[PDB]
Amino acid sequence: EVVLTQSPGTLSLSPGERATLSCRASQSLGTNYLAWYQHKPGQSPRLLIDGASTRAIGIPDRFSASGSGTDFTLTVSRLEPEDFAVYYCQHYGNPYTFGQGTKLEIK
Amino acid sequence: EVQLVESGGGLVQPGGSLRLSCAASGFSFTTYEMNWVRQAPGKGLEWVSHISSRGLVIYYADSVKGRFTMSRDTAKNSLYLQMDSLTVADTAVYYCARHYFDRDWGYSGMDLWGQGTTVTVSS
Amino acid sequence: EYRNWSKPQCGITGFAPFSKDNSIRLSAGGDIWVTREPYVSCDPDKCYQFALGQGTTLNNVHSNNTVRDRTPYRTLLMNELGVPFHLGTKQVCIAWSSSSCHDGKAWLHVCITGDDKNATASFIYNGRLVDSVVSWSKDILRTQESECVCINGTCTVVMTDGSASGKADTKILFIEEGKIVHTSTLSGSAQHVEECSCYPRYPGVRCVCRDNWKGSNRPIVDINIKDHSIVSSYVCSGLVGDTPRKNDSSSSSHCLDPNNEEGGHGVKGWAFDDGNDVWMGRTINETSRLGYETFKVIEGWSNPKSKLQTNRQVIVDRGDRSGYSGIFSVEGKSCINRCFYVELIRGRKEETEVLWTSNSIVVFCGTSGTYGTGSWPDGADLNLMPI
Amino acid sequence: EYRNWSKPQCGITGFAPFSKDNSIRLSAGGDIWVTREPYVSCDPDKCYQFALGQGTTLNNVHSNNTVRDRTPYRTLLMNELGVPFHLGTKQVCIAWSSSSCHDGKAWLHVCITGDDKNATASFIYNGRLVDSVVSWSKDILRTQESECVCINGTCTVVMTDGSASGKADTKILFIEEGKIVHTSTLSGSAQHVEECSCYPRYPGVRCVCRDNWKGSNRPIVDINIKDHSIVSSYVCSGLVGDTPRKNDSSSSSHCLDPNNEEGGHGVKGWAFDDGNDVWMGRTINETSRLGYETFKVIEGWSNPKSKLQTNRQVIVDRGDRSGYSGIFSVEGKSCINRCFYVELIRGRKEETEVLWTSNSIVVFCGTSGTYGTGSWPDGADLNLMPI
Amino acid sequence: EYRNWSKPQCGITGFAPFSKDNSIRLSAGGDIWVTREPYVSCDPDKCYQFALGQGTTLNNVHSNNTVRDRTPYRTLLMNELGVPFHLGTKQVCIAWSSSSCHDGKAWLHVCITGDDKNATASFIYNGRLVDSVVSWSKDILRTQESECVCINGTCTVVMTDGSASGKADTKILFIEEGKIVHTSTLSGSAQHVEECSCYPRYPGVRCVCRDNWKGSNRPIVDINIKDHSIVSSYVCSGLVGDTPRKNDSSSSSHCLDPNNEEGGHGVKGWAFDDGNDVWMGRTINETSRLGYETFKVIEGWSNPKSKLQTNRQVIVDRGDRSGYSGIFSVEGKSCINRCFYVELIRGRKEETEVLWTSNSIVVFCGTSGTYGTGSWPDGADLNLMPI
Ligand SMILES: *[C@@H]1O[C@H](CO)[C@@H](O[C@@H]2O[C@H](CO)[C@@H](O[C@@H]3O[C@H](CO[C@H]4O[C@H](CO)[C@@H](O)[C@H](O[C@H]5O[C@H](CO)[C@@H](O)[C@H](O)[C@@H]5O)[C@@H]4O)[C@@H](O)[C@H](O[C@H]4O[C@H](CO)[C@@H](O)[C@H](O)[C@@H]4O[C@H]4O[C@H](CO)[C@@H](O)[C@H](O)[C@@H]4O)[C@@H]3O)[C@H](O)[C@H]2NC(C)=O)[C@H](O)[C@H]1NC(C)=O
Ligand SMILES: *[C@@H]1O[C@H](CO)[C@@H](O[C@@H]2O[C@H](CO)[C@@H](O[C@@H]3O[C@H](CO[C@H]4O[C@H](CO)[C@@H](O)[C@H](O[C@H]5O[C@H](CO)[C@@H](O)[C@H](O)[C@@H]5O)[C@@H]4O)[C@@H](O)[C@H](O[C@H]4O[C@H](CO)[C@@H](O)[C@H](O)[C@@H]4O[C@H]4O[C@H](CO)[C@@H](O)[C@H](O)[C@@H]4O)[C@@H]3O)[C@H](O)[C@H]2NC(C)=O)[C@H](O)[C@H]1NC(C)=O
Ligand SMILES: *[C@@H]1O[C@H](CO)[C@@H](O[C@@H]2O[C@H](CO)[C@@H](O[C@@H]3O[C@H](CO[C@H]4O[C@H](CO)[C@@H](O)[C@H](O[C@H]5O[C@H](CO)[C@@H](O)[C@H](O)[C@@H]5O)[C@@H]4O)[C@@H](O)[C@H](O[C@H]4O[C@H](CO)[C@@H](O)[C@H](O)[C@@H]4O[C@H]4O[C@H](CO)[C@@H](O)[C@H](O)[C@@H]4O)[C@@H]3O)[C@H](O)[C@H]2NC(C)=O)[C@H](O)[C@H]1NC(C)=O
Ligand SMILES: *[C@@H]1O[C@H](CO)[C@@H](O[C@@H]2O[C@H](CO)[C@@H](O[C@@H]3O[C@H](CO)[C@@H](O)[C@H](O)[C@@H]3O)[C@H](O)[C@H]2NC(C)=O)[C@H](O)[C@H]1NC(C)=O
Ligand SMILES: *[C@@H]1O[C@H](CO)[C@@H](O[C@@H]2O[C@H](CO)[C@@H](O)[C@H](O)[C@H]2NC(C)=O)[C@H](O)[C@H]1NC(C)=O
Ligand SMILES: *[C@@H]1O[C@H](CO)[C@@H](O[C@@H]2O[C@H](CO)[C@@H](O)[C@H](O)[C@H]2NC(C)=O)[C@H](O)[C@H]1NC(C)=O
Ligand SMILES: *[C@@H]1O[C@H](CO)[C@@H](O[C@@H]2O[C@H](CO)[C@@H](O)[C@H](O)[C@H]2NC(C)=O)[C@H](O)[C@H]1NC(C)=O
Ligand SMILES: *[C@@H]1O[C@H](CO)[C@@H](O[C@@H]2O[C@H](CO)[C@@H](O)[C@H](O)[C@H]2NC(C)=O)[C@H](O)[C@H]1NC(C)=O
Ligand SMILES: *[C@@H]1O[C@H](CO)[C@@H](O[C@@H]2O[C@H](CO)[C@@H](O)[C@H](O)[C@H]2NC(C)=O)[C@H](O)[C@H]1NC(C)=O
Ligand SMILES: *[C@@H]1O[C@H](CO)[C@@H](O[C@@H]2O[C@H](CO)[C@@H](O)[C@H](O)[C@H]2NC(C)=O)[C@H](O)[C@H]1NC(C)=O
Ligand SMILES: *[C@@H]1O[C@H](CO)[C@@H](O)[C@H](O)[C@H]1NC(C)=O
Ligand SMILES: *[C@@H]1O[C@H](CO)[C@@H](O)[C@H](O)[C@H]1NC(C)=O
Ligand SMILES: *[C@@H]1O[C@H](CO)[C@@H](O)[C@H](O)[C@H]1NC(C)=O
Ligand SMILES: *[C@@H]1O[C@H](CO)[C@@H](O)[C@H](O)[C@H]1NC(C)=O
Ligand SMILES: *[C@@H]1O[C@H](CO)[C@@H](O)[C@H](O)[C@H]1NC(C)=O
Ligand SMILES: *[C@@H]1O[C@H](CO)[C@@H](O)[C@H](O)[C@H]1NC(C)=O
Ligand SMILES: [Ca+2]
Ligand SMILES: [Ca+2]
Ligand SMILES: [Ca+2]
């Protein structure tokens, strides 16, 4: 019943710029059960952000995240060649649901 | 080192059954919540099912509900997905993942992922 | 020899500084245990600090990713109040949940360890394993994480088992010299009860718990140490103490039922009563565990709809990290004094410049004299400490 | 003042967690002794852990190649149960073999050190060197590696001297305040007796030993503390406890003689009797010291060919390392309780990513209540620890 | 059980070496607390050393810039006399100012912490927080930084509050079992009184303080422990003991009033009286805290205009660093002995090759026998120690 629409689909940029990804949520949800994953193709998903604001263990400092209620945002402040992939926002509280994703490709 | 290894991906004609197994090394299922997540080809990630550390299946996706059965053996540390009546929409790469329920903070988020096993329902 | 807590309650106008351990600051140089969920308890002579250690020190490879709460390696550490958890610390049981009493003769430790589905509570008295219990609800069996209370040799421990957001079975166990003599199922108006801070309100025990399911006010469990009769209600003050909670302008209480306001999660805390007024402590930030203030709400134990503070103190500043806090009572010369401890959490899941999670403690006690202002944070600088 | 162990045996339905030291995990950061061959013993107040330390810490250059068992530097270390073997540990004698009693008045230590041919056993009581003995068979003189038992001030120690695979002279020494008052040569049906786990089965002592020559069942030595008469037999249960052993389906016992099955080597272990049933513990792997499980064999103390377990517990998981285990008895309020300890060995000769060998201990005690499931391994990660 | 100090004063011809802690030398290898402002006090059995620790060790990142005196992290550390402040040291209260008594039954700690404007003084007796006071002058509340004195259960503490160069309110607090029973405002000829070294001159207490405003002679506060009547004057000897002070040839006292000579700042020190003569100690350098010598001025307690010295000793050499010094009395078999301690300060603001500030202590006691010469500096080499 909460549908997480990742707003930008196929955002394209060049190494060293700032990328802003958005997950908007149908209805308001507890802002501590939302997470952000990176899925580079041919590799298993990797968790980047947890609790909508917490960097995972080992993730570089480039990624940061924020949000509240229906709005959520992720930003890789300075891009890198290998930070180009699909990005999912997940709600792991009830009701369980993923996002459709956002594709980052080198221009 | 902790690792998850999924096995059992194979061709299945429609209406069939396949059992996926995820073997865990470096930790016990008696303290971690285990998940089956699938990616159909050309679409995003989809959360198939979730099982607690206390052994309860908390959730089954609506499509998979009634056809898939998710279980676990806490002696061999294995996770199983018995898929019955496989349709062509169920062709996907399957992933066993792990997250945590903390008494103080609560659910955490899937930090450990497997290699993946691909199940293709065909013809 | 037994302890009966018969004296009145001391006149309290506020709380004065009593102790500080500086654990994280000393951990930068030196071998200090990685701990969390601490508390304080006193035998008739002096006071001791307890914690749940993760089976490793901080300048350790095993200190990495210690944010979990249920591992086979967590044990219960006990020192005198003031001595930091160095490598000479005696770890008194295997436990990822714990509680501790002193009945005037010997120490009692309740220690929970095991699988989340099965879980065992070992009851250890006078250095013997006297009793043991299994999970009744086949879920995460857990207990007060602070001191329990003994009156005439009968000690009381509140143990919860079941879902964190839902109906859970809470029981009150009456222990005599480590042996469980009775067990009363919880009954009353409190729906979810966890991590209770209990104190001897002679002739019984009064516990202020956390509602982790549907309320931001705190539950109250009144245990009759004698008839083994349990009563439950909620802290009646309009200024509620759980975090997350709503702002003071718009917070409410029911004095019987959960308020259904920002009640999703919570934090372990305390409160007690002075006549009709309530002495309470909570975090300064209403959503994160940042800061810690104690104050007195006038007619707050007796009336929902009272938001009148008095005698406010700022124990930790608004921007400094706090955590679990709890109460413990100290027998004085002519009355019973109330003290509290605050756990100052530092590390991963809120500060991502380190890979570990640990805590320090700061201890205050009630006073009938005067006091000033201050702020006693943890003080550790994690930008310079080893990861 | 003396201890006579007169009370009955406590009702045992299983064992509950009691202690864990986390020695290897703390050794990664901090100075912790390199030990092996530990045990536990209790004076009438609390319990103590003992070990044989290799004269060095783990983050030490001297920690390299510490897999030997007989060096001039090994000493006997004693702390309270729970305190890890830090650098403040009191080492109470020079010993590469050891045993320890408490008769209710003072501690007794039996310490064997010296050359393999001519070895010396010092008997230390109340902080004095009271007596001394030389090897009788001019071979590796060795003793229980666990606690000895005193009844009315007379303590009993089982000491073996001779070939590990062959006829060796085993003696039972009766000590009074450190002075050896009597010495009985072993007599009975047990051929090879080593590393005995003894407990006070009033009015005497019952020891379950290891057969390192021709059996995978354990020997039994019944010492009459009064008449100084020795009886020997074998543990009669069809599920034998030594490792290496044959698989459960194809194992046997004799109640009198070695079964001649996979009896080449062995491991120190324990067993005791509840009526006709036998409570026992062994490693989960039948060939390596991996895992540790305890259970009860029905009519296992009186009937061979019985393979009917009950009340099985998994103390250490099947994939994790264990080692020597032993029994010690604790005087309760109305009965005598049985506890055991398991030694979790980590390091060289089985894990070649480090140059050292050490151990950690996990302690369980019997309970008349209920219990759950779990697994309490050592937890050290040797891929990251210093070599 | 109470202590009444009724015996006469021991015959003193000089002072003999008693203790040394070597804190800075051990801090180069090992974990040692960063401290300053130490003192010594003895219960009827043995003697203890106290210090104000900065909440960190010396080989620590938090050791950087520890020259401040008022931080939320300073606590009061207590060990036995001789044991260095290792990581097992019990820190007994939150305090950036402190004093400590033993009345023959239990320890009393006066601990001042908090904001500079509103500061809190906690009075802790027998491990309880018994009392608390707030700043009266709303300035830096401060106390003796050495031991206080109890006679028949009534202990006396001198506390100053107000400007360092100006009129400050000094009070004498009479405490009974931690409870403040009386408070006398200071009255007499002493204008500025700080950091008093008090000793039981039965039937009362005599304190020699520092004048941090207008004098280089030391104030004297005579407290009648019974009538609670206070008398104030100045040390009458022509050889004044404060530093900064004028050279021996040009110095003067007034025996009632400040001398108005080099009285801008000062250092905590001591002095006591033997008949008409005065036994005193001071730094050898007249301007910096370098060196330390004790001697006896003949008719120095009754006559200004006396510069006759005798029995001179050089406890620390002219070129070695010293600091705060103080007195403490020890009950002998037939008389009361006087001992003193010297604080040897090392580190930043005077030696800019390190980023920290710490201290060591050297303790001497009076003797009726003979003695030799020597010099006992700190000995640390800061050019090789970690910054
Ligand atoms: C030196 O140290 C002493 C001891 O530590 C300090 O004294 C203490 O000072 C505190 C803070 O002023 C006193 O706390 C009290 O605050 C009560 C309200 O809580 C406030 O804080 C919370 C959290 O920030 C806010 O949410 C509240 O705000 C709400 O209400 C205010 C106004 O009501 C609104 O403006 C807000 O927007 C919110 O709606 C508060 O700000 C307060 O109720 C309590 O009451 C006293 O004063 C009021 C008049 O303002 C009287 O009506 C009431 O009866 C009390 O009057 C007392 O004070 C006088 C003078 O002392 C006495 O003569 C009376 O007998 C009576 O005691 C109070 O303000 C705390 O009480 C106090 N403790 C003691 C023991 O004195 C000093 O501040 C400190 N000084 C320094 C720094 O040098
Ligand atoms: C929560 O914790 C409690 C306490 O920790 C657990 O309860 C304990 O559970 C164990 C589970 O097995 C009980 O262990 C006993 O095991 C006996 C031995 O068999 C087992 O080990 C051998 C060697 O590993 C294995 O080979 C077995 O597997 C098979 O092979 C053997 C022969 O090789 C066959 O005999 C078997 O049939 C298998 O093919 C097992 O791992 C076992 O014999 C013993 O017997 C119980 O059940 C049999 C029927 O099978 C009854 O005849 C017998 O009387 C026992 O029944 C009692 O116990 C059960 C509880 O399990 C009660 O419900 C009954 O009313 C009756 O009292 C048993 O299996 C151990 O006894 C038990 N301890 C207790 C209850 O105190 C819980 O499992 C755990 N739960 C959760 C949530 O995890
Ligand atoms: C072995 O150990 C013992 C014990 O440690 C040492 O004996 C002690 O030695 C000291 C130093 O000689 C004795 O100190 C006393 O010093 C008084 C003056 O102190 C001097 O130094 C200070 C600081 O530099 C100066 O301030 C003084 O004043 C100088 O300048 C002022 C002006 O500013 C002038 O006015 C002064 O006159 C000075 O110019 C001093 O230089 C000193 O007055 C005191 O006097 C005693 O000795 C003198 C002769 O030295 C006598 O005339 C006088 O009557 C006193 O005599 C007694 O003591 C001596 C022993 O020194 C006996 O032999 C006599 O019989 C008589 O009893 C004295 O000098 C300290 O008293 C002394 N302690 C004892 C004995 O217990 C030994 O030196 C040491 N030996 C070694 C190194 O092997
Ligand atoms: C602190 O703890 C974390 C958690 O164990 C450690 O991070 C993990 O480190 C391992 C080893 O580098 C990583 O495994 C590697 O994964 C990649 C695929 O992602 C694989 O190709 C490699 O063969 C290897 O298996 C693991 O991903 C990483 N996990 C996480 C959650 O970050 C970390 O090393 C520890 N850090 C320190 C400084 O001790
Ligand atoms: C206290 O919290 C309430 C929400 O529970 C705040 O009320 C909302 O505030 C926003 C911003 O001013 C307004 O847009 C909404 O219309 C308010 N809604 C409600 C429910 O009143 C309130 O402003 C907060 N008060 C303070 C002082 O922070
Ligand atoms: C309470 O803590 C929260 C953090 O949970 C504070 O929220 C931050 O506010 C600042 C602006 O004031 C933002 O830049 C940050 O993004 C916010 N979030 C975080 C995670 O830092 C909040 O201001 C604090 N104060 C109160 C009383 O709500
Ligand atoms: C238990 O061990 C016995 C050996 O003592 C195993 O019996 C042998 O097993 C192999 C492999 O199945 C056969 O080739 C042999 O013919 C068997 N010989 C004997 C002596 O029976 C037995 O299979 C083992 N059982 C289990 C279940 O592991
Ligand atoms: C008991 O331990 C032995 C090791 O002594 C295990 O044997 C290993 O088995 C795996 C395959 O299962 C082989 O790849 C290894 O080569 C074997 N040896 C070693 C040294 O690792 C054995 O599987 C364990 N289990 C039992 C019950 O026998
Ligand atoms: C002691 O100090 C006084 C100053 O208080 C010194 O007297 C001055 O010394 C200088 C240098 O000799 C002369 O220029 C001045 O004329 C002196 N003035 C006074 C006030 O007398 C005295 O020399 C010092 N004595 C010693 C020995 O150091
Ligand atoms: C007392 O200490 C001071 C330092 O405050 C010494 O003064 C030094 O004297 C030497 C020459 O003797 C100069 O080179 C230095 O510049 C001076 N200052 C410092 C800061 O080192 C003084 O000599 C010492 N002695 C006395 C008795 O005054
Ligand atoms: C509680 O104990 C104290 C001392 O042990 C005793 O004086 C008092 O009467 C007791 N109170 C009651 C109610 O029995
Ligand atoms: C404790 O024991 C005393 C003496 O028997 C009794 O007076 C008192 O009521 C008891 N208190 C309770 C509530 O158990
Ligand atoms: C054993 O000692 C206890 C107490 O010392 C005593 O009560 C008991 O009678 C003794 N048992 C025997 C058999 O003497
Ligand atoms: C132990 O001592 C008691 C009292 O002397 C005696 O009754 C009992 O027979 C003795 N038992 C043994 C085993 O020596
Ligand atoms: C001081 O106490 C001692 C022993 O406690 C006693 O002998 C002496 O008389 C007391 N002095 C006075 C003056 O009461
Ligand atoms: C100390 O106590 C003794 C005995 O009570 C008494 O004679 C003397 O006057 C007291 N002195 C004081 C109060 O200093
Ligand atoms: Ca809540
Ligand atoms: Ca064998
Ligand atoms: Ca001055």
mmCIF file of C-alpha atoms in Angstrom, chain C residues 2 40 63 77 131 133 160 189 195 199 208 215 219 227 238 241 249 272 278 294 312 325 336 347 357:
data_model
loop_
_atom_site.group_PDB
_atom_site.id
_atom_site.type_symbol
_atom_site.label_atom_id
_atom_site.label_comp_id
_atom_site.label_asym_id
_atom_site.label_seq_id
_atom_site.Cartn_x
_atom_site.Cartn_y
_atom_site.Cartn_z
ATOM 1 C CA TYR C 2 18.452 -9.287 54.839
ATOM 2 C CA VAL C 40 24.363 0.409 38.806
ATOM 3 C CA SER C 63 35.484 -4.540 17.903
ATOM 4 C CA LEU C 77 30.765 -7.381 33.596
ATOM 5 C CA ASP C 131 17.930 -22.002 38.857
ATOM 6 C CA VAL C 133 14.073 -21.075 32.983
ATOM 7 C CA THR C 160 9.135 -10.163 28.895
ATOM 8 C CA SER C 189 -3.842 -1.828 31.849
ATOM 9 C CA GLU C 195 13.150 -2.818 30.230
ATOM 10 C CA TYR C 199 12.628 0.674 42.896
ATOM 11 C CA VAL C 208 8.550 2.286 35.286
ATOM 12 C CA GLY C 215 2.686 4.572 23.645
ATOM 13 C CA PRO C 219 3.989 1.949 31.888
ATOM 14 C CA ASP C 227 0.671 -11.082 48.088
ATOM 15 C CA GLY C 238 1.262 15.165 30.390
ATOM 16 C CA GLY C 241 9.245 10.505 28.752
ATOM 17 C CA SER C 249 3.061 21.631 23.145
ATOM 18 C CA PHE C 272 9.376 7.941 40.427
ATOM 19 C CA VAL C 278 6.596 12.939 39.464
ATOM 20 C CA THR C 294 15.563 15.564 34.529
ATOM 21 C CA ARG C 312 14.820 21.140 35.706
ATOM 22 C CA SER C 325 18.956 5.475 31.692
ATOM 23 C CA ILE C 336 15.961 5.925 50.985
ATOM 24 C CA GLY C 347 29.901 4.737 17.695
ATOM 25 C CA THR C 357 29.666 0.783 19.281
#
